[PDB]
Amino acid sequence: EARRAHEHLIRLLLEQGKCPEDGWDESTLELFLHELAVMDSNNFLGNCGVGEREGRVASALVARRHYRFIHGIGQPKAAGSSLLNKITNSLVLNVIKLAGVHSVASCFVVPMATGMSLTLCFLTLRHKRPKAKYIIWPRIDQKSCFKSMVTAGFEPVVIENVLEGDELRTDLKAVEAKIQELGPEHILCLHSTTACFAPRVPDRLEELAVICANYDIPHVVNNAYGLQSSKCMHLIQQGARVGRIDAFVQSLDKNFMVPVGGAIIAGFNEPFIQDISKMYPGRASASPSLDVLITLLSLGCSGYRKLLKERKEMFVYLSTQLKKLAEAHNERLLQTPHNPISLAMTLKTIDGHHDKAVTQLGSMLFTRQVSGARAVPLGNVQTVSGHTFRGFMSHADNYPCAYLNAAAAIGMKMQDVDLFIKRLDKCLNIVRKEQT
Amino acid sequence: EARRAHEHLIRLLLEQGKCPEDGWDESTLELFLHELAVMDSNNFLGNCGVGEREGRVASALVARRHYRFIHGIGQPKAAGSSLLNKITNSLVLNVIKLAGVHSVASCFVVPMATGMSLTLCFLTLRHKRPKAKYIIWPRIDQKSCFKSMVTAGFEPVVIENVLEGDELRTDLKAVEAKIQELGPEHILCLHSTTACFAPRVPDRLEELAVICANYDIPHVVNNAYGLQSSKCMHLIQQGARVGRIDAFVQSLDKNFMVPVGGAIIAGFNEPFIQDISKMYPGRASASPSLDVLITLLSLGCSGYRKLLKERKEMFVYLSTQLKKLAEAHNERLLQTPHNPISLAMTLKTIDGHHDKAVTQLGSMLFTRQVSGARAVPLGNVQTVSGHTFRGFMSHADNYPCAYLNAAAAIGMKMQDVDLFIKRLDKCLNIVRKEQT
């Protein structure tokens, strides 16, 4: 029977809580979703509602586009939304393992993006560490992760990066020096970062993990877009094994190709991760969870695994093509072998004329429908939530050159690289011709 | 021309930023949505993406159900999502005015539910008031609003309510006594509440507003489900006129009949409300905004206004039917004329036998597909985030009786009341027969 085949797949999902090897057909998926939504009281045919939160919906466009999941995630009032939440977190745990953190103990989807999800971690740790006022943070010029600390009501302690060749790396001496200066009890946590813009590289998590274990200080990893990278994930896995990592947080959109809106908070200590979940007040949107559930069931392990493999290949393709273009314009690819996602070519040939050529190149790429490229000048001064950054965008006060960023992130296609290379070549020609 | 008629409506929305008098046809709405999504870079036909957040989508089910809005709300990378956000906040401001707060200066949708949205207000006020550690809070037995204070890292100062007849009301003397005891500078804010479970009533906002203006302390109003009530909204409007209200927060789902997930933060001081918006780190889900935009454009002013009128009528219908049932079972409707949404009938005839009959009645209603009713016993002890509540569910340590809650909230139908009355009558009969 056709129906039994669908039920077999559903039952296997419910009993194991694992991503199916092969992606489900849409037919199976929509059957499952409809049966789940049937379990929510708002969808009961015999229901009457006499409360203030009945999951009533005025617009049929709204109800249908959400598969009639209205109540969000948590006698129960929403048994299907609850099961949706359970399944999705179970699927996500298994993908975390698949992706490289095999010892992960616990995780949960939270329908806030990565910044606010990090804030939630910091808000939870306040009650663990009432004496703490500082968060030690190796510098990365990204506004949201930096603001997350201020939002949580702590003061960031910005640790400048060390220039090693072309790469910007964790200053481990300065981190330990600030712990000793300020006092371990006054530090809320170390806030490290994996995936980042080249020529910065993922933080030295093993070493920071050792430092945190020894000084007895929480370690929170901004893994925003590092789940897609088995190298970034090995760094988390190794760090947890050789020292201390308390939580790692990753974006749903950047690693799973779904709308912006949600993140995953994961860790190795189940009671602690539960404490973060419990620190969240009230119901939350089920929409990020639904998007990731749809995506993971449709892809299967094999589909997600293939996406990860294709990204590695696109990275190789992107670097070989960008290095070739760079060199053809008498530029070079910065040597950043410790960054597995992001790369940078120098813009020395257009910089230095005092005509804003580097910024102009960025705008030119933008108006030619190139998105995601970052033209980083020398000398941006920018103040973010109380803190003034010298050399903003470059993660250092005095990086030796201007450069252009590009990145091979999950779902990148060959036409992404090809069109980029084509339009970048033309833009470089225009600028240089203008400078004569 | 047919197309010009659609464009006229769209252009009028864009130029005035106001809810159309009559609801748009779905045809107009979907035209508009598709044209908006066209403005996001991920949807550009000529686009190439070389960054880490390109709004790529693996699942067609996911992309389509969100109308291809992927990037969430904020060179720009997402011009349509940005315009969506602008329009929606403008529509919401106008509905706030429509609903009873005509002097509202500023507001924004935040894709967190009401609890976390209140937390965000408290997180913002931390930077305004570094010496503050306390939030003064007239008691309401609702976990999320209470937890919001703890999550923000403040300690709640629980002010017990005064029993006046059957109603539980703001103890204004105790509020002022705690301000003086603890010191104005050590108070982060007063956290009041409008719409609530009977026999509690909306807080005395005019008087609290006067107190807050005089002691120079912020006033944050939990208006979770009070937007649907012109009486609750008059209380906010009057309070702002005679004293101080800094922010008022309301649920999207409870006032607009959309999925759980979002809230509105509004106020009378534009710079301050902007500061709360700016305290939020990173991008956020556009899904709550989209749901409310769809809903408000489809309803129009006239449709939303009609929903508000129908709720008032359903309240009258619900109370007349519940009073009639109560009296037929030798119970009574508690006299709560200061609560415009929630009501309560006594359960004295089944309580007092030491057999858990009140709790049992609640479960009986639940298993008979009645949702939203609250059977409140005498004597619940419950600890929430560090604080132990006596008489939990009843908003007081010694409320004189057990009672049952019901409420006429927006979108309630006559069959909601009728089925409820029918099943409640049968349940009361069963319990009483059992007690002989």
Place this chain on the structure above:
Amino acid sequence: EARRAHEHLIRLLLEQGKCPEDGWDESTLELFLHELAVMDSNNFLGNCGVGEREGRVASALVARRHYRFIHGIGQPKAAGSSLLNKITNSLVLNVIKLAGVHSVASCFVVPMATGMSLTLCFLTLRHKRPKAKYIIWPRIDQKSCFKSMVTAGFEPVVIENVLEGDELRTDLKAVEAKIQELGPEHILCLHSTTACFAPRVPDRLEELAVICANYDIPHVVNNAYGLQSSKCMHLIQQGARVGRIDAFVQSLDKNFMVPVGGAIIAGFNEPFIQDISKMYPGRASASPSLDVLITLLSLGCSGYRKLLKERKEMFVYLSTQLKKLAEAHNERLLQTPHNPISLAMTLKTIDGHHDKAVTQLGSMLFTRQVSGARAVPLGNVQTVSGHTFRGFMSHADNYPCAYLNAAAAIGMKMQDVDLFIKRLDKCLNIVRKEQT
């Protein structure tokens, strides 16, 4: 259990094959559709296809919009599409009874519109009556019903209508005179018509039925848009009781408010109706059947019955408003009490100036977004499939005046009448002002 409630409704549909009293919720309907489509082999998860008609679908937009019903209607290859067809025909039979033909024996949806469905009836009757070459047809100026006879390969025998007051009615003497002239065996059938443009009225079916019973000649009724009228349906029911009706055919779109595309063929002799079904070669589109199934399950008996009641009320409203306008312009409503759907006001005040004012009025209404009105002049000569019609549009060679048609058909709203009246008034004023 929520799911059991849905299954109860489905099971009741499957066991009785009758329209539910109250409309199904969309949730129940889509559950049912998905479960049905599961029964088609193309949707089997374990299926392999090695034939030429496997129901493969390239476009996900196409597959989804049809609920994955691909195979159309008929070891079996399509068990769900087959069950869909069975259910839909059973629902339609019951609506035919509801609508006024309680003795209907058999019917089937055919995914051709009414013209081709009549052709199919004529094609079937060819094999019953090999000597027949003529179809006797009381005149109605509608191209499709007339062409249906030619398409079938018969020659129409056009019987002119009798003017009785303002109405055009069946010339029963001329019908019988042509039977006798041509010979009963040489007549394939009588092709009568119910719902039609005023001032024509439904054919005299009782009398024609008696004639057909006596001369032993098939009687095929064009009931294109007469199902929505209990008066038109009583005429079919009475005619079948007092004489002979072999088949009656009605449009799906005009009586059920669904896309153009399908029709119903019904009758009182089950073997004969089966013969028409069997005369159709090959598979056919399931789309008309699906549309009517969705519509009838969502409406229920009560919803469809309410639509029929509202149409009667709109007819009264339309005539009272049109009579009032007519008289205000010194025109009159033609006295057509035997037409229950269509009406006509005279255009004598603008006609007669030899300036094409009547045609011009029709175009003016069209450019002012009035659809469905017919401005009928005196003196249209028009040739349709070999036959030249004098006074084309007016169903007679010498109807005494020009007039304007309007009709109250199912789903008409008060704003349809109101806007029509408003724009018609303005148009009449413009024309008369021009004629000075």
Place this chain on the structure above:
Amino acid sequence: EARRAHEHLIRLLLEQGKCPEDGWDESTLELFLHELAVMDSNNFLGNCGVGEREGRVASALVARRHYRFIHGIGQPKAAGSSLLNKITNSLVLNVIKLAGVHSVASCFVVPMATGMSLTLCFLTLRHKRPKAKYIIWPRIDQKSCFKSMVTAGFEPVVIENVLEGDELRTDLKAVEAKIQELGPEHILCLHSTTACFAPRVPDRLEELAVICANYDIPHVVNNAYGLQSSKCMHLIQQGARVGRIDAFVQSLDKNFMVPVGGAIIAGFNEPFIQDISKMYPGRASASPSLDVLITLLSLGCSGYRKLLKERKEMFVYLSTQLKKLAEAHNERLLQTPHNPISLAMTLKTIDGHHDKAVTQLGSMLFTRQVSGARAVPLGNVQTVSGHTFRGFMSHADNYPCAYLNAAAAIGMKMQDVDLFIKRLDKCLNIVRKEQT
């Protein structure tokens, strides 16, 4: 601008009426569809309707799933549906050329399946040839094409096929012998067939075309599933060049992977093809046209061309795998090099035991979710619409053996062949073990 890029594609479609080289994104397609539907009067915001066919829709599920195309295909009342029809027929003409008939003059989508579309051709030819009563038809055991002739009211003249090796081929002598016997004027047309079940092969169209040109008799080609085959299409193209072909008809579902429901009628004489279109009475469903428009715009030339290439490859794969299996069971692949889509392996090893093993094998494959296979026994007697077929299913009275059919049709995947081979192998083993 993003919007201009979409409009450029649309404008190019409208000006050239040709399939885009590369498939449109869904975004572009749905934009286009929505803009088209805007042009139909039922969708006009300012519209009032006072007629009997206003395109009103009761169900939002129905309206939305058809993109608000309600009126079907034809002052005008439906300008967008009309343009839809125009575009689709233009796209289809170009695909006919792409597929191998480069000299095609005219074609149109008709929303009837292939059988009824052939009937329409025969119905049209009746008026061209009033003396004709016969249709000469080389035998193919397919019920719908045979019934199409009877439905049209003609008598089929069944020409038995000639056995050449393993193939069944056109008996050209018998065709000419029947023309001479019955008289050219009494023949309505020759009804030939291209794509068919092996071991029958496509009719000898060049030779039949010469015969038809010489005797002055119409030639109607059943090209039901031959459009997907450049060899079948070359036969039509060559036949038209060396002789007479008046119309060729093909299934939409079998060549374009859309629901059953529609067909294309094409030819080389534009006035004649127009005459067939004009012989159709009334409006018709736009749904088949919409499905093929969606499909062709999403695929582009390149996508459809790739599908055709993949089918050729799947044919090679299917035959090599089926030949290998056959031989492993001491059977053989029948030598049918003139059939480019269908193949047959002998079932001699299980046939001959008088135990219905051949029929049983067919049922076994069916219950193991193999669809589209045909187990053809020796000796089926079956009467279809008045005519008794000896050896029904095998296209001859005395085909030497029982065999099994399989076919590589458009959209076939490797798993279709692989699973089929796997399950067929197991079934053969079961049967042979049972026969000991």
